[PDB]
Amino acid sequence: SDAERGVCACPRIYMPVCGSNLKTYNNDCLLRCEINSDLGRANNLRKIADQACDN
């Protein structure tokens, strides 16, 4: 339920990454959490790059 609802424990580090929705996530863990959630899988969300989108 928590994984599906996008509730995950993540370090509070700033190491931004870029999702296929063109949104910057503040670290890989946060993106990994949305990817595996219902709403992320809903949108076929994936990681596109290992830096902030556009930076």
């Binding site: 995950c8 370090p11 509070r12 580090i13 700033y14 503040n26 946060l30």
Partner: protein
Amino acid sequence: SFDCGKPQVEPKKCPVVGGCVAHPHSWPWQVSLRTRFGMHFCGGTLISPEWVLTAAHCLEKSPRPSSYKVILGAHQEVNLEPHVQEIEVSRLFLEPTRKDIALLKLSSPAVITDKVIPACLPSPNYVVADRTECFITGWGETQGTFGAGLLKEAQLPVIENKVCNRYEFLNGRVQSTELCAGHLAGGTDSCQGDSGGPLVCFEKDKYILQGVTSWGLGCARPNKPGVYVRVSRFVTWIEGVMRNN
């Protein structure tokens, strides 16, 4: 000349997401941890002229000290002030039982000043009491709030692990070597980019480093307090790395 835990600029002490912008240099032990490329990704706490305390996951990208730059005495994140120090890491020391805490050796011992002072360390296995108001500081994510780009502070009550581990809160994840802190209604919390920074609690005279910013479920959500490494469960290891080095 100076002593730990005693800011020469009186903190603001607000009633980082939420909180406020700190009075410049009222948290003189706050460090900004940057890569060689020189951009802020983690906080840290100065323990002594040469040593820094931070979170282990701040280091899990490169095992090499040359890849790290500790910024002392700063208030602005990008346009560093002219007095600010920029010292390069010489050694890294990971906590041996895979806990989220680590030590950094400074190549040139930073010079103590009215704006660069270390924090005091708790006594071993001290347990911060439930509802104790402490402060967390850093440059991390702000979510909808103000002060992005400047050092922020937030005053937050400790929640005893017993309550924090209840199902409606963090559901058994926290355990003994960590502490919780935050408001039940949410809205005030550390966040991404604050990792490895200090959680300090005032004790009579001075501030004591009691937590290292570590993890959480999101940031500032209701019923989801932040989780910090319990510094008192590790002081016997910190001193030895300074002592035996």
